[PDB]
Design an enzyme around this catalytic site. Structure first.
Site, short mmCIF file in Angstrom:
data_model
loop_
_atom_site.label_atom_id
_atom_site.label_comp_id
_atom_site.label_asym_id
_atom_site.label_seq_id
_atom_site.Cartn_x
_atom_site.Cartn_y
_atom_site.Cartn_z
N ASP B 44 -8.42 34.55 -24.19
CA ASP B 44 -8.80 35.61 -24.41
C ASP B 44 -8.03 36.81 -23.36
O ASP B 44 -8.10 36.45 -22.44
CB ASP B 44 -10.33 35.87 -24.18
CG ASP B 44 -10.89 37.12 -24.76
OD1 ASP B 44 -10.40 38.01 -25.28
OD2 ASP B 44 -12.35 37.41 -24.45
N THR B 77 -9.15 42.40 -28.82
CA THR B 77 -8.25 42.63 -27.57
C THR B 77 -6.87 42.51 -27.58
O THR B 77 -6.11 43.49 -27.28
CB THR B 77 -9.01 41.69 -26.41
OG1 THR B 77 -10.34 41.93 -26.44
CG2 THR B 77 -8.37 42.03 -24.93
N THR B 78 -6.21 41.24 -28.05
CA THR B 78 -4.83 41.15 -28.03
C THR B 78 -4.12 41.32 -29.33
O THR B 78 -3.02 41.51 -29.56
CB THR B 78 -4.72 39.67 -27.68
OG1 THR B 78 -5.38 38.57 -28.66
CG2 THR B 78 -5.19 39.31 -26.46
N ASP B 367 -18.49 36.25 -29.15
CA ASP B 367 -17.59 36.62 -30.16
C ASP B 367 -18.05 36.64 -31.45
O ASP B 367 -17.77 37.79 -32.18
CB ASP B 367 -16.09 36.09 -30.08
CG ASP B 367 -15.68 36.28 -28.85
OD1 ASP B 367 -15.91 37.14 -27.93
OD2 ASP B 367 -14.65 35.47 -28.12
#
Lengths: 63, 502, 499, 507, 193, 98, 88
Positions: B44, B77-78, B367
Site C-alpha cells: 500500500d 493512493t498509488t 479498504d
C-alpha cells in the site's frame, strides 16, 4: 569537427566583429590608418580601407 | 527556463517509477525499515509514501495528492500518482515542440470534462432494481480487494463482515456512511480462521476471578444491562504522589441505587473488594483504557461519571448482556458485549498468525469498507478495472480532430497517457502490454461497448462482467480529477527556490 | 550489442538534423570546409553528403539513398533523408518498450505498401495526350533557376522531346539517352533538338575538309592511323636525302592502304577515338582522305564511345580486318553549323531498324554560367516528365499528402486488434516532419501551421492556384527507399573489424 | 569601478526573472522554501520578496521598495519590481558606450514627470453614468474571475462577494476584515455567506449528544483559566494516613476548581470561548443548563469576537462585568464538510465577517480563495477611488507612445534615454502574453497597429487572444497604482545605479 | 579451457543472428573502410574475420567441409557446436563431470537423435506429383534469409522443375548459372538449350 | 503454460539441490550418487536412497532412516512461501536510523 | 534484485555445510575472541551474526517462527529457501 545550433551563431558574430573593427577607425576623411605586419617582418601603411582589407588575414571562414 | 521544465519531469518520473510495478492485485511488495529497527512489508502506498522521507519539493505534491484521497477513497493512493505521471510524459514532448505549458494545462481541463460525460451514459444501477440484488453484488465486491492479500484464502468468510458492518451504521433514509463509525482493532497471535463479526466492544478482561458469573442476569426482567463508566477505580483510594470496610459499603450502596451491574473503571481493583461483590451479584471490570471508555458510551448510550457521588440512571450505558467467550486454546479470554439493536457504531474483530499479518488483514478489510461507502452514496456504478482507461481513450481520440486547435495535441497525449494504466497492469500480470492494450479496445468496437478489464486476476477471457469486479463511479471521477488538477499545478511552478536549514 | 544499434540511430539522426533545415528554397545553407582548403557552400543535400567524407558506415548509406532517389524520381533528395531520420527517431522509443528491431522493420512493410495505394486515391490521374498540363508542370518547376523568364520556352521543349520518344503506355524511360551538348556562343532563346546525335568537337580544321555530306554513314572505329611503332627498341638514322624519301614512301604506303579499304567501303564520315598514348591520324592521311571526300572527326572522348555505339545503331571496330559495311550506321544529312565560333556538327535522319529513343539537345550560351546551369535546369525538367510517364497522376506538394496519409492511416488502424494497433500507428507520426521543416524554414510557426493543415483536410482536399505541383514518383520513391534504408540499419547488430 | 555596476545588473535581472512568471492573474506561481521548513507558494510579489531574504544590497532594494508598494497601495508589487529592474538591462549597453549613469537617471525623472500628467488625462471620473448601484460592483468581479475554474459558478460567487464589501462601512475597508474559512468537500455552488466569525472546531473531547446547536440569543463570555479537574502540569501534594481523607483531598482539589466553575453560571452566558482546552468536567456541568463551551480556539479568531459582539476578556470569573457580554441574532452549527462548524449570524456591531468556501479538494479551494482576493481589491477600490484608468495593456502602451513623440523635440543624450525608457515599458504587456500562453511576437506587432489610429483605450483581451478595447472587457484599475508604480520603480532604480562600489564588512 | 570455451562462444555469437529467415545481417569493416559489404552468409563471415584463437580455427576448416557437401545449414552447425560448449562449462565446473564423460555422453545422445529422425521420416513413392510438392517446400527453406525471398514464390517452381529435368547423376555440372544485369528478378526462366 | 513451464521445471531441480549439498558435505560424489538414484526410482521399485556411511545406494528401510509426514510437509510449504516474499520485493526503503 | 538474491544466498551459504550428520560446523568469533563457540545449529548462527541487508533479515525472522513449530530441519528450510531464489 562539426558545430550546429545556436553555438555557431555566436561564433559568426565574434569572427566578423574583429574584422569589422579594422575599418571602423578609417571611415571618413578624419579617420586613421594602421600598419599591416607580415611574417617576413616588413609592413606598410595606407589610409585606403580597400587596401587594408585586401591584405587582411582572416582565419575564420565566416569572416 | 529550459533546465527547469526538463528536471521536473525527470524528478517526478523517478519518484513515480517506484510504485508503478506495485499497482495492482498482482503488484510487487516492498521492504520498509522503520527508524526503530523494525522491518515492515506492504504494497500500500499510504505506508510507503509516509515512511519514505525525501527533500524533493516536486514529489511532496504527490504525497498530498493521495493524502486527501485516502480518506475519500483510500484505494487510489498509488493509482492517482501513476495516472498523473503519465500526463507529465506527454507534456514533456509538447514542450520540446514549442508549445507553451499554459495551453497544455488548459488543454487537460477540457479533456476531463468531455471524458466524464462519456462514462455517464454507460453507467448502470444496482440498488435501483431490488434490495436483495444489492447485497448480491455487494457481497462478492469485497472479494476483489482481498485477492492480493493472505485473506484470499478466507475471502469467502470475511466477505460477509464488510456488508453487515455498514448496514448497522447506516439508515435507509439518511444513507450516511463514515469510516469513523467503524473501529478496527486487532492483536498479535492466533489465526485468521477464528475471526468472527461481533457488534460491540471488547475490554480484554477475564472478570478478575472465575467465581463471577459468565453471564449477566436480567435482574427480574429489567431493561437491558446498565453498566457504569467511571474515571476512578473501585478500591480504597490511594494518593498518586507517595475505615476500609466501611468504605466498601458506601461505594456498593451507590451502585444498587443506580441499578448498575457491571462496573467498568480505568484502573485495577483491590482483591478484597471483589470478595463482597460475589454475594451482591455485582460483576466488576478493571484495566480499561481511557479511549475505550468513550466508545462504550457511544454504543451503549452512556455517559462518563467522574466521581462516585455523580452516579445516575441516565448516565449508565445499556447493553443486552456481557459474557466471556474463550477463543481456541489462547489464555487471553476476552469479553464480548452485544446489543441486538441498531447502534451508531460497529467494531471489526481481526486476528492473524503474525504482527504484519494482523495489519495486513486489518488494512485490507478497511479498504473494502471505503468502497461500500461510495456504493451507497453513488447509485450509478461501473466496472472500473481496465475498462475506464480503454474506453476514455477511444472517446477522446475520436473527438480530438474535431476541435481543430492547440488542444488537439493535448487530447491525443491525454488518451495515450490513460493507456499507461492498463499497460502497467498488463506488465504486472505477466503479459505483453502491447497486444493487451488493443485487445481491450477491439472488443469494445466491433462487438459493442462494455467493461472488459485486465487479466491480472484471470478468467477465461478479459471480461470483468462475470468476474464481478466493480469500482465506484464517484471514485473513478475523483481519481482522474486530482490527477489532472495536480498536473496543472506541476506546470504552474515555473521556478524552484530551496533555502538552507538553520 | 544494442549499444551498436542505439549509436547508429543517434549518429544517423544527427546527420538528418542538419539536413532537415536545408529543405526547400528557404532552407538554411551549410558551411563545408574540405581538408584541402577549398570552401564550398550550397543547399543541395546530395552535394553536402558527397563532400562530407563520411566515415561511419551506417551514415554512408544515406549517400546511396540520395543517389538512388535522383536516379529514379530526380527530385526530393533532401526530403528522402528527412524521412529516413524520422523513422529512426520514432523507433528509438520503441526499443525502450522491449520491441525487437525486426518487428519494427517488418511493420514498415505493411505501412509502405498501403501508403502507395492510399496515395493513388487522393492523386488525380492525368494523361500524356494533354500537353497543356505538361508544359505548366515543367514551367513552374523551373522557378528555382536563375532565369525565370527564359524558363517559359524551355518547358514545351522538354515535353515534346519525351512525347516523341515514348508511347502512350510506358514504364522505364532512360533520361541518360538524351545528351545535352553545351557550346560557348549563341543565346538561350535559340535552341534546337537534333534527332540523331551531336558531337562535342569539330571535324576538320585544315584545308580541303568538306565539313558537310549528304547521305552519309557513321560508325565507330577504335583503330588509329599511325606509322608503324613496334614495342621493341629501334634506331632510325637518315644520312641522305634519298634515305629520308625512301622511309617516307614506305610509311605513306602503309598510311594509304588503310585509307584504300575505307574508300572501298563507301564511308563518308569516320570517327576516331581520342588516345593520348600515340597519334590518332597522321597529317598525311588527312590529305589522302581529303581528295576522297571522307569526313573525319577526331578527339572523341571516351565517355561518348558507349553513347555512339547504341543510338547510332553501329558497332565498335577494333581492327580494319573486321571492318565491314554492315556494321556502320546511316545518316540522312550531316552538316557543320557555325554560330559565333561554334562549328558544331549535327546528325539527323538515322532511319535505322536498330534505332532507339535517343535524341540530342544542343545548349548554347555566352558566359560559362549560362550553359552550366541550363544543363542542370533542363535535367530537372526531364525528371518531372519521367515521373508522369512511369506513374500517371500528380499530387499537391508542400507537406499536404504527408499529413493526409497520417490522418487516414491512424483512423483505419484503430479497427485492428492486439499488436497491430500499437506499433503500426507509429509510422503515421513520423510523416509530420516533412511539413514541419517546410514551415520552420519559411519562418512560419511550427505547431500552428500544422494544426491549420489538419483543419482543411477533413473539409477540403489535397488542393492548386499557386501553381505548385509535386510529382507522385517523388513521394512514391520516398517512403519506398526509406523503408529499405531504415530496415538495413536496424538489421545490423554489430560492426567488427574484418581483414 | 564599472565592474560593480555590471555585477548589480545581473543581480536585478535575477530577481526580476523570478517575478516574470508571477505577473498577471493567469501567471505562473513561484516555489519558495523557507528555512522554517514550510512550503509557501504565492504569486504576490510582496510575500515572494519577503521570504527570500536576499543578502545582495541592490537586490534588497527591490525587496524594500515592494514593502513600500504594499503599504501605500498594496496592489502591483510584482509589476513595480519588473519595471524597476527593466531599466537595468536597458542601461547596460549605454554604460559600455561611455554614457554616464547620472545622465540616464536624469532622463527618467523627466519622462515620469510627463507620464504622470498623461495619467490624469486618461483617468475619467464616472459613477452613475451608464451604470447602476448594484451592477457597478458585480461587473467588476466577473473580470477577475474569468479564465478560471470558477467561471461557470461565478454567477453565485459574485453575489457573495459584493455583499461582503457592502457589509462594512464604505469609509474604511480592509481585506483582513473579511474572513475566509476553507471547508474540504462539497459542491462549489452551495457555499454561503456568514455575517459573523467562525473557527476550526478542534475540540476532541467526549461528552457529545448534549448542548444543542439551536439557540435564540446566547450570551458570549470569554474564558481564561482551565476548568477541568486535573491540571496540565502542577498538582497538590497531601500526605495523610486516614482512609477518609483520601476521598476528601479528591473533592478538595475539585472544590477550588468548582469555585471559578460555578461563577460562570452566575454570569448566565450560554457561549464560552477559551484559548485553552476545556476538559470533560466543565462540559458535563454545563450540559444540564444547556451552556455551550469550546476550547482550543486560535488567538486570531478571538480578536474578531471582541469586534463582533463588543465583548472583553477577563482573567478570573469574579470581576467579570455585565456589559462585557454579547449576543448574536442566530447561532447554528453546520455539519458541512464532515465536520461541525460553529458560526455567528446577525451581529449589527460586527466589524468583520466570514465567507465560507466549498470545493472538491483543499488545493482546489486554495486557488479559489486567492483568485477571490484579486477581485476583492477591485471591488474595494471602486468605491474608495472614483478615478480609474483602463488596464490590461491599454495604459501601458500609451505611456510609451507619448514619450516617443516628446523625445523628438528634445536634443542630446536624453532623446535615446526616453526612447529606452519607452521601450522598457514594453516588458509589462510582454510577460502578460507569455504567462497566458499567447504568442508575444504577433500580439506586440498587431496591438501597435490600432494603437496608432488615435484611440488610447485599446487593451489586450485576457480570454481569447485578440486585440481590442478593455472597456467592454470591464478591466478597471485605479489611478493611484499607475502613478505610484512609475515613482517607486524610478526611485528604486536611481538608488541602484548610484552605487559605484559595494562595501561589505564581516563580523 | 577458459580461452577455448569463451573464445568459441564469441565466434558463435557473431553468426547467431544469421540463422533463419527472420535473422539479421552482420556488417564488417576493414582498415580501408571501402570493402564493407552486408551479407548473411556464415561462410563469408568466418573466413574473412581474422582470429588469433587456435581453437576457433578448428571450426573454420570444419565449416569448409560442410559447405562443400551441401552449402547451407553451416550457421546451425556452428551455433549448435557453441551451445554444447556453453553448457559444458556448467557441466564441468559446478556439476562435477569429467570432460571425457561429456564426450562419451554426446556419442550416446547422437544415436538417439538419429533414431528420432528415422522414425519421423515419411516418404511417398506413389503419386510423384506429391513428391514434386515436397521439392517445392524444401526449395522455399533454402531460398530463405536471402533477397530472393520476395520472388521465392515464383522461384519455387523454377528450382523444382530444374532438378526434374536431370534424370541422372547428382553432379551439379549440368546446371550452369548465368547472371545478366537489367530486369526484375521474376524474369528468370528455365532453359535447357 | 508458456511462461509457467520453466518456473515449475526449476522447482524440480531445486529439490535435488538438498541431496547434492548433503553429498558434498559428506565428501562423496554428488553427481554420481544422485543421478543413479533417480534412475531406479523413476520406473517402479522405489526403496533405496543415499547412504552417507559406505558411500553407495542402499535401502533406507533396512538402515532405519525415515522422516515424519508433518515434518517434511512444513519444509516444502514454508520454504515455498518464504521464497515468494523475497522474490516479490523489487525495492527496499530504509528510513533514517535514530 | 541483485541485493536480494546475493543476500539470500549468503545466508544459505552459512548453513549449507551444517546439513546432515556428516556436515561441517561453523566457527564464530566476537571482538573479545573469548566467546568463540562451535555449533551447527542454524538458529544460533543466524541470530548471532549481524547483517546489514534488511532482505536477509526477513528469511531469518521466518526461520524463527519455523524453529518454534518443529525444531528439527530448520537448516534444511533455510537452504531450500535459498535454492529457489538462487535458481531464479
Amino acid at each position: 569537427e562539426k558545430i550546429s545550433g545556436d553555438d555557431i551563431r555566436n561564433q559568426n558574430v565574434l569572427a566578423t566583429m574583429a574584422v569589422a573593427n579594422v575599418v571602423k577607425s578609417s571611415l571618413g576623411p578624419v579617420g586613421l590608418d594602421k600598419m599591416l605586419v607580415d611574417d617576413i617582418g616588413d609592413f606598410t601603411v595606407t589610409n585606403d580601407g580597400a587596401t587594408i582589407l585586401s591584405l587582411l588575414d582572416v582565419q575564420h571562414p565566416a569572416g | 527556463g529550459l533546465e527547469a521544465k526538463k528536471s521536473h519531469i525527470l524528478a517526478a518520473r523517478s519518484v513515480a517509477s517506484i510504485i508503478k510495478t506495485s499497482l495492482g492485485p498482482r503488484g510487487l511488495d516492498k521492504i520498509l525499515i522503520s527508524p526503530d529497527g523494525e522491518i515492515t512489508i506492504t504494497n500500500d502506498g499510504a505506508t510507503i509514501l509516509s515512511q519514505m522521507e525525501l527533500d524533493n519539493e516536486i514529489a511532496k505534491l504527490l504525497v498530498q495528492l493521495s493524502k486527501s484521497q485516502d480518506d475519500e477513497i483510500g484505494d487510489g493512493t498509488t493509482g492517482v500518482v501513476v495516472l498523473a505521471s503519465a500526463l507529465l510524459d506527454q507534456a514533456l514532448e509538447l514542450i520540446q515542440k514549442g508549445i507553451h505549458p499554459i495551453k497544455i494545462a488548459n488543454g487537460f481541463d477540457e479533456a476531463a470534462k468531455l471524458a466524464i460525460s462519456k462514462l455517464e451514459e454507460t453507467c448502470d444501477d444496482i440498488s435501483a432494481s431490488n434490495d436483495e440484488l444489492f447485497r448480491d453484488f455487494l457481497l462478492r465486491a469485497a472479494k476483489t480487494s482481498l485477492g492480493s492479500k493472505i485473506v484470499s484464502k478466507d475471502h469467502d468468510r470475511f466477505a460477509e463482515m464488510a456488508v453487515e458492518a455498514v448496514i448497522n451504521v447506516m439508515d435507509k433514509d439518511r444513507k450516511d456512511v463514515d469510516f469513523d463509525l467503524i473501529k478496527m482493532q486487532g492483536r498479535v497471535g492466533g489465526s485468521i480462521s477464528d475471526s468472527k463479526l461481533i457488534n460491540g466492544v471488547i475490554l480484554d478482561k477475564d472478570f478478575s476471578h472465575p467465581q463471577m458469573p459468565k453471564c449477566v442476569l436480567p435482574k427480574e426482567g429489567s431493561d437491558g444491562v446498565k453498566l457504569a463508566i467511571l474515571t476512578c477505580p473501585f478500591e480504597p483510594p490511594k494518593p498518586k504522589t507517595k475505615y476500609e470496610q466501611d468504605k466498601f459499603k458506601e461505594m456498593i450502596d451507590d451502585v444498587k441505587k443506580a441499578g448498575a451491574d457491571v462496573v467498568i473503571c480505568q484502573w485495577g481493583f483491590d482483591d478484597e473488594a471483589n470478595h463482597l461483590l460475589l454475594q451482591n451479584d455485582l460483576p466488576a471490570v478493571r484495566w480499561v483504557g481511557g479511549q475505550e471508555l468513550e466508545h462504550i458510551a457511544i454504543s451503549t448510550n452512556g455517559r462518563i461519571v467522574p466521581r462516585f457521588q455523580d452516579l445516575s440512571k441516565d448516565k449508565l450505558g445499556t447493553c443486552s448482556r456481557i459474557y466471556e467467550q474463550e477463543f481456541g486454546t489462547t489464555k487471553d479470554r476476552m469479553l464480548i458485549i452485544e446489543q441486538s439493536k441498531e447502534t451508531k457504531t460497529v467494531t471489526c474483530f481481526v486476528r492473524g498468525s503474525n504482527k504484519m499479518i494482523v495489519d495486513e488483514a486489518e488494512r485490507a478489510l478497511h479498504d473494502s469498507l471505503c468502497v461500500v461507502r461510495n456504493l451507497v452514496k453513488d447509485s450509478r456504478v461501473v466496472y472500473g478495472g481496465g475498462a475506464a482507461e480503454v474506453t476514455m481513450s477511444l472517446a477522446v481520440s475520436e473527438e480530438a480532430d474535431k476541435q481543430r486547435g492547440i488542444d488537439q495535441y493535448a487530447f491525443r497525449g491525454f488518451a495515450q497517457a490513460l493507456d499507461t494504466i492498463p499497460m502497467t497492469l498488463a506488465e504486472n500480470s505477466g503479459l505483453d502490454p502491447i497486444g493487451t492494450l488493443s485487445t481491450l479496445k477491439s472488443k469494445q468496437l466491433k462487438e459493442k461497448i462494455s467493461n472488459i478489464g485486465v487479466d491480472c486476476l484471470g478468467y477465461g477471457s478479459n471480461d470483468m462482467k462475470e468476474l464481478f469486479v466493480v469500482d465506484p463511479f464517484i471514485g473513478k471521477k475523483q481519481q482522474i480529477l486530482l490527477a489532472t488538477q495536480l498536473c496543472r499545478m506541476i506546470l504552474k511552478i515555473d521556478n524552484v527556490i530551496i533555502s538552507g536549514k538553520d | 550489442p544494442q549499444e551498436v544499434r542505439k549509436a547508429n540511430i543517434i549518429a544517423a539522426r544527427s546527420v538528418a538534423d542538419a539536413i532537415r533545415t536545408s529543405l526547400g528554397p528557404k532552407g538554411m545553407d551549410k558551411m563545408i570546409k574540405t581538408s584541402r582548403g577549398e570552401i564550398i557552400i550550397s543547399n543541395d543535400g546530395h552535394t553536402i553528403l558527397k563532400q562530407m567524407a563520411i566515415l561511419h558506415p551506417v551514415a554512408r548509406m544515406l549517400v546511396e539513398v540520395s543517389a538512388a532517389q535522383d536516379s529514379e524520381a530526380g527530385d526530393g533528395t533532401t526530403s528522402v533523408v528527412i524521412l529516413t531520420g524520422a523513422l529512426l527517431g520514432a523507433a528509438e522509443r520503441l526499443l525502450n518498450k522491449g520491441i525487437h528491431p525486426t518487428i519494427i522493420a517488418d511493420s514498415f512493410q505493411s505501412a509502405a505498401k498501403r501508403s502507395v495505394d492510399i496515395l493513388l486515391e487522393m492523386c488525380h490521374k492525368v494523361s500524356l495526350s494533354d500537353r497543356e498540363q505538361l508544359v505548366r508542370a515543367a514551367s513552374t518547376s523551373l522557378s528555382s533557376k536563375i532565369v525565370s523568364q527564359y524558363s517559359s520556352f524551355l518547358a514545351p521543349l522538354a515535353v515534346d522531346s519525351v512525347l516523341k520518344i515514348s508511347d502512350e503506355n510506358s514504364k522505364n524511360v532512360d533520361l541518360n539517352d538524351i545528351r545535352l551538348v553545351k557550346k560557348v556562343g549563341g543565346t538561350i532563346d535559340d535552341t534546337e533538338m537534333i534527332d540523331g546525335v551531336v558531337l562535342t568537337q569539330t571535324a576538320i580544321k585544315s584545308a580541303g575538309g568538306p565539313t558537310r555530306k549528304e547521305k552519309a554513314k557513321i560508325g565507330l572505329i577504335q583503330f588509329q592511323i599511325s606509322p608503324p611503332k613496334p614495342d621493341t627498341e629501334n634506331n632510325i638514322i637518315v644520312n641522305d636525302y634519298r634515305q629520308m624519301d625512301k622511309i617516307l614512301k614506305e610509311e605513306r604506303a602503309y598510311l594509304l592502304n588503310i585509307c584504300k579499304k575505307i574508300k572501298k567501303a563507301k564511308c563518308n564520315v569516320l570517327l576516331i577515338q581520342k588516345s593520348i598514348l600515340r597519334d590518332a591520324v597522321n597529317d598525311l592521311a588527312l590529305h589522302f582522305l581529303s581528295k576522297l571526300n571522307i569526313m573525319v572527326v577526331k578527339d572523341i572522348e571516351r565517355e561518348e564511345i558507349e553513347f555512339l555505339s547504341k543510338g547510332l545503331g553501329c558497332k565498335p571496330i577494333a581492327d580494319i580486318e573486321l571492318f565491314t559495311e554492315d556494321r556502320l550506321g546511316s545518316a540522312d544529312l550531316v552538316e557543320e553549323i557555325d554560330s559565333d565560333g561554334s562549328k558544331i556538327v549535327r546528325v539527323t535522319g538515322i532511319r535505322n531498324n536498330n534505332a532507339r529513343p535517343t535524341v540530342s539537345v544542343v545548349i548554347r550560351g555566352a558566359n560559362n554560367m549560362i550553359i552550366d546551369e541550363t544543363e542542370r535546369s533542363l535535367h530537372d525538367a526531364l525528371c518531372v516528365i519521367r515521373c508522369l510517364v512511369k506513374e500517371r497522376g500528380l499530387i499537391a506538394g508542400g507537406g499536404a499528402p504527408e499529413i493526409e496519409i497520417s490522418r487516414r492511416l491512424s483512423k483505419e488502424a484503430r479497427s485492428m486488434e492486439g499488436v497491430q494497433a500499437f506499433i503500426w500507428q507509429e509510422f503515421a507520426s513520423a510523416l509530420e516532419v516533412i511539413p514541419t521543416t517546410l514551415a520552420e524554414n519559411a519562418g512560419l510557426n511550427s505547431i500552428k501551421v500544422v494544426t491549420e493543415l489538419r483543419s482543411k483536410h477533413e473539409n477540403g482536399e489535397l488542393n492548386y492556384e499557386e501553381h505548385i505541383l509535386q510529382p507522385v514518383l517523388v513521394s512514391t520513391s520516398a517512403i519506398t527507399l526509406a523503408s529499405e534504408c531504415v530496415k538495413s540499419i536496424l538489421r545490423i547488430d554489430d560492426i567488427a573489424f574484418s581483414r | 569601478g564599472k565592474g560593480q555596476i555590471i555585477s548589480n545588473i545581473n543581480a536585478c535581472v535575477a530577481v526580476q526573472e523570478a517575478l516574470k512568471p508571477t505577473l498577471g492573474p493567469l501567471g505562473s506561481d513561484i516555489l519558495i522554501v523557507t528555512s522554517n521548513q514550510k512550503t509557501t507558494i504565492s504569486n504576490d510579489g510582496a510575500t515572494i520578496l519577503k521570504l527570500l531574504d536576499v543578502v545582495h544590497p541592490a537586490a534588497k532594494t527591490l525587496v524594500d521598495i515592494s514593502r513600500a508598494q504594499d503599504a501605500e497601495v498594496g496592489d502591483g508589487t510584482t509589476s513595480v519590481t519588473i519595471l524597476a529592474g527593466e531599466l537595468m538591462k536597458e542601461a547596460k549597453p549605454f554604460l559600455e558606450e561611455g554614457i554616464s549613469s547620472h545622465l540616464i537617471m536624469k532622463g527618467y525623472r523627466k519622462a515620469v514627470s510627463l507620464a504622470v500628467e498623461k495619467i490624469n488625462e486618461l483617468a475619467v471620473d464616472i459613477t452613475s453614468e451608464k451604470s447602476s448601484g448594484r451592477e457597478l460592483l458585480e461587473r467588476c468581479a466577473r473580470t477577475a474571475m474569468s479564465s478560471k475554474l470558477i467561471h461557470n459558478n461565478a454567477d453565485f460567487f459574485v453575489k457573495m462577494c459584493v455583499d461582503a464589501v457592502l457589509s462594512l462601512d464604505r469609509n474604511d475597508l480592509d481585506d483582513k476584515l473579511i474572513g475566509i474559512k476553507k471547508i474540504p468537500g462539497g459542491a462549489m455552488e452551495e457555499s454561503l455567506f456568514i455575517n459573523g466569525v467562525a473557527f476550526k472546531k478542534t475540540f476532541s473531547y467526549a461528552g457529545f449528544e448534549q448542548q444543542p446547536k439551536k439557540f435564540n440569543n446566547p450570551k458570549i463570555l470569554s474564558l481564561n483559566v482551565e476548568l477541568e479537574l486535573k491540571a496540565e502540569k502542577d498538582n497538590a501534594e497531601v500526605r495523610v494516613e486516614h482512609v477518609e481523607d483520601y476521598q476528601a483531598i479528591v473533592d478538595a482539589e475539585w472544590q477550588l476548581i468548582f469555585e471559578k466553575l460555578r461563577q460562570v453560571e452566575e454570569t448566565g452566558a450560554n457561549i464560552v470561548l477559551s484559548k485553552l482546552p476545556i476538559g470533560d468536567l466543565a462540559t458535563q456541568f454545563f450540559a444540564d443548563r444547556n451552556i455551550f463551551c469550546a476550547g482550543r480556539v486560535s488567538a486570531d479568531d478571538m480578536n474578531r469576537v471582541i469586534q463582533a459582539v463588543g465583548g472583553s476578556i477577563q482573567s478570573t470569573t469574579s470581576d467579570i462585568k455585565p456589559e462585557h457580554l454579547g449576543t448574536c441574532a442566530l447561532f447554528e452549527e453546520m455539519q458541512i464538510g464532515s465536520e461541525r462548524y460553529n458560526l455567528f449570524q446577525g451581529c449589527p456591531q460586527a466589524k468583520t465577517c466570514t465567507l465560507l468556501l466549498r470545493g472538491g479538494a483543499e488545493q482546489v479551494i486554495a486557488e479559489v480563495e486567492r483568485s477571490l482576493h484579486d477581485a476583492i481589491m477591485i471591488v474595494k477600490r471602486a468605491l474608495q477611488n472614483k478615478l480609474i484608468v483602463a488596464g490590461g495593456g491599454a495604459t501601458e502602451m500609451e505611456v510609451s507612445k507619448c514619450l516617443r513623440d516628446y523625445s523628438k523635440t528634445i536634443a542630446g543624450k536624453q532623446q535615446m534615454i526616453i526612447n529606452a525608457f519607452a521601450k522598457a515599458l514594453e516588458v509589462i504587456p510582454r510577460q502578460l502574453c507569455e504567462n497566458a500562453g499567447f504568442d508575444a511576437i504577433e500580439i506586440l506587432n498587431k496591438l501597435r497597429l490600432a494603437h496608432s489610429k488615435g484611440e488610447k483605450w485599446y487593451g489586450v483581451v485576457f480570454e481569447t487572444e485578440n486585440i481590442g478595447d478593455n472597456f467592454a472587457k470591464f478591466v478597471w484599475e485605479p489611478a493611484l497604482v499607475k502613478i505610484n508604480a512609475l515613482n517607486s520603480a524610478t526611485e528604486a532604480t536611481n538608488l541602484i545605479l548610484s552605487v559605484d562600489e559595494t562595501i561589505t564588512n564581516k563580523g | 579451457r577458459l580461452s577455448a570455451f569463451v573464445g568459441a562462444i564469441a565466434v558463435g555469437d557473431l553468426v547467431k543472428s544469421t540463422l533463419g529467415p527472420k535473422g539479421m545481417d552482420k556488417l564488417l569493416q576493414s582498415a580501408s573502410s571501402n570493402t564493407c559489404m552486408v551479407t548473411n552468409d556464415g561462410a563469408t563471415i568466418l573466413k574473412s574475420i581474422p582470429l588469433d584463437n587456435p581453437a576457433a580455427k578448428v571450426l573454420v576448416n570444419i565449416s569448409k567441409v560442410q559447405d562443400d557437401e551441401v552449402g547451407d545449414g553451416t550457421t546451425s552447425v556452428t551455433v549448435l557446436s557453441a551451445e554444447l560448449l556453453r553448457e559444458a562449462e556448467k557441466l564441468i565446473d559446478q556439476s562435477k563431470i569429467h570432460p571425457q564423460t561429456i564426450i562419451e555422453g554426446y556419442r550416446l545422445a547422437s544415436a538417439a537423435a538419429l533414431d528420432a529422425l528415422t522414425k519421423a521420416a515419411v516418404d511417398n513413392s506413389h503419386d510423384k506429383t506429391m513428391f514434386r510438392e515436397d521439392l517445392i517446400h524444401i526449395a522455399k527453406t533454402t531460398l530463405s534469409s536471402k533477397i530472393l525471398s520476395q520472388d521465392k514464390d515464383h522461384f519455387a517452381e523454377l528450382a523444382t522443375n530444374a532438378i526434374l529435368r536431370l534424370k541422372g547423376s547428382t553432379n551439379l555440372e549440368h546446371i550452369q548459372i548465368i547472371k545478366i544485369l537489367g530486369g526484375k528478378l521474376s524474369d528468370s526462366f528455365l532453359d535447357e538449350g | 503454460d508458456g511462461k509457467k513451464s520453466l518456473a515449475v521445471e526449476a522447482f524440480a531441480r531445486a529439490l535435488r539441490q538438498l541431496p547434492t549439498i548433503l553429498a558434498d558435505n559428506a565428501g562423496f560424489d554428488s553427481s554420481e550418487l544422485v543421478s543413479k538414484l533417480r534412475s531406479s526410482i523413476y520406473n517402479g521399485i522405489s526403496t533405496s536412497g543415499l547412504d552417507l556411511n559406505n558411500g553407495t545406494i542402499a535401502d533406507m528401510r533396512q538402515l532405519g532412516i525415515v522422516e515424519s509426514y508433518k515434518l517434511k510437509r512444513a519444509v516444502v510449504s514454508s520454504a515455498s512461501e518464504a521464497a515468494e516474499v523475497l522474490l516479490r520485493v523489487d525495492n527496499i526503503i530504509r528510513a533514517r536510523p535514530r
